Design a protein around this ligand. Structure first.
Ligand code: DHT
Ligand code: DHT
Lengths: 284, 284
């Protein structure tokens, strides 16, 4: 019938655009379940959905807290068609700042949402896809999950986690008929993201003036990279679709090639000394 | 004076051997703080310490729960010399079994201990090392942190996390004078490990007979790899020492080269299709 897709973290960014991009497809081959943690944020999903003229019933909204298995279970039961053909694990949190400046709860929230939240989604949805011998799971990756970035230690950790988690499953799912693929995104044009970067005094009292100085320096550098490398979510969202459609999807898809040169030098030197070096100069 | 080293997870394996290997050094240049989560497990650390004839006062035991920052802070204050020259982040948990068969708390414990526990150690100890402009941090890695392994999804995730976390910091610590290095271990001869693998009925009721069958199949395969590739902890522990002594340590040290061929094919194909394939055949 119609491909049933459930996407997490749809209140903005990639999740939002992908949801409406799927539900608004001229072919109307997709039934989308856009879940968000807080429903008071569905506004933009809906205004965006009116903008693309998604036919009614092509887009349903669900409250889903990936930090809660009960919510994960309850939303899974809201899928009237009693089946999900494409599960998109997109919900994710960021974290920028000196390691010593990051609150313990903040660190725990990012791993809990980004990694364990994805585990819960996989636990609740993988079984049936395995039983039915079919299904596709897509997980939003990040260049940060492929290489470490200064002041993104915990973010990268959780993104790296996702790589390990999916690669591990991938080895097991190969003969099962269910496909898992990571979508490695570089910066994705977001006006708020470039706004999130800029923490003076609060970070200053939680770290030394030399680390602090390097933070600013790194903020300045991300700023540039964004303003000259950021991709439109319409563009990134189109990669999910490419993967979702590939008859034999690969474990991972890259939304850009800009960061591929850096990634190569990463395994052109397993000792990590070359990358840490290129990347340090690269940012400072 | 004497190099002060604090090691976590010393109740067994690498932590234990490294602790006594450092404290028993003929040169006696090291003062060791072997922390363990439960003191009722210090027996083997001590019997091992008598075996190597560690001079009295070369080895102090501390209760440290890396799942608790208060415990992390309290043990940090137990370091009488008011300084740590070498911090070894070794505490870690394993997890084997179908993703759907893993308890939520179990998944959360492994990330909490392996990743966030390491964050807390880094948060509490990095500052001073940064201030003093010197210090070495070593983190026990794993081949599982460099490539995904079936039925080790959550273990690999946390190990992958550690890679991201350390690589991120590494970029920032380069000019600071504090060195961070990961010690990537392959299997390390442990009679209990080969015993931990073997969960019939309990795992059977939490997953399908086909996944279950593949689990057994994978258990069988690890069994072999261990019985013919496992390294003595004395051997692995000697790598920590190599790193601890290198004037310019690299971000990572490999205890063996057995798994290096597999790791290369991992970035000789960023799409992951080659590795997932080699590794699947490799295990099944
Ligand atoms: C690592 C990069 C790219 C290269 C670099 O030297 C620093 C810079 C810092 C911000 C990163 C950016 C690439 C895309 C990331 C990882 C986004 O996903 C969120 C933060 C962005
Ligand atoms: C991945 C390997 C090695 C290669 C393989 O095909 C499967 C096998 C499964 C058990 C792993 C082992 C290497 C070392 C590990 C990752 C230990 O650290 C703990 C479990 C071990």
């Amino acid at each position: 019938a119609r491909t049933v897709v459930l996407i997490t973290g749809c209140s903005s960014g990639i999740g939002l655009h992908l949801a409406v991009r799927l539900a608004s497809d001229p072919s109307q081959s997709f039934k989308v379940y856009a879940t968000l943690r807080d429903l008071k944020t569905q506004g933009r999903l809906w205004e965006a959905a009116r903008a693309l003229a998604c036919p009614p019933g092509s887009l349903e909204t669900l409250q889903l807290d990936v930090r809660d298995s009960k919510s994960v279970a309850a939303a899974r039961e809201r899928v009237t068609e009693g089946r999900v053909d494409v599960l998109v694990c997109n919900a994710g949190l960021g974290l920028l700042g000196p390691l010593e400046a990051l609150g313990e709860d903040a660190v725990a929230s990012v791993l809990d949402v980004n990694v364990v939240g994805t585990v819960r989604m996989l636990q609740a949805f993988l079984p049936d896809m395995k039983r039915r011998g079919s299904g596709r799971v897509l997980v939003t990756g990040s260049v940060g999950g492929l290489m470490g970035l200064p002041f993104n230690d915990v973010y990268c950790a959780s993104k790296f986690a996702l790589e390990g988690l999916c690669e591990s499953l991938a080895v097991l799912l190969l003969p099962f008929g269910v496909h898992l693929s990571l979508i490695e995104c570089g910066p994705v044009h977001t006006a708020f993201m470039e706004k999130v970067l800029g923490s003076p005094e609060e970070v200053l009292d939680r770290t030394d003036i030399h680390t602090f100085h390097r933070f600013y320096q790194y903020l300045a550098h991300s700023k540039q990279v964004f303003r000259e490398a950021a991709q439109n979510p319409e563009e990134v969202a189109e990669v999910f679709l490419t993967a979702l459609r590939a008859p034999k999807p690969t474990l991972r898809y890259f939304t850009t090639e800009r960061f591929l040169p850096l990634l190569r030098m990463r395994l052109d030197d397993p000792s990590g000394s070359n990358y840490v070096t290129a990347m340090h100069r690269e940012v400072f």
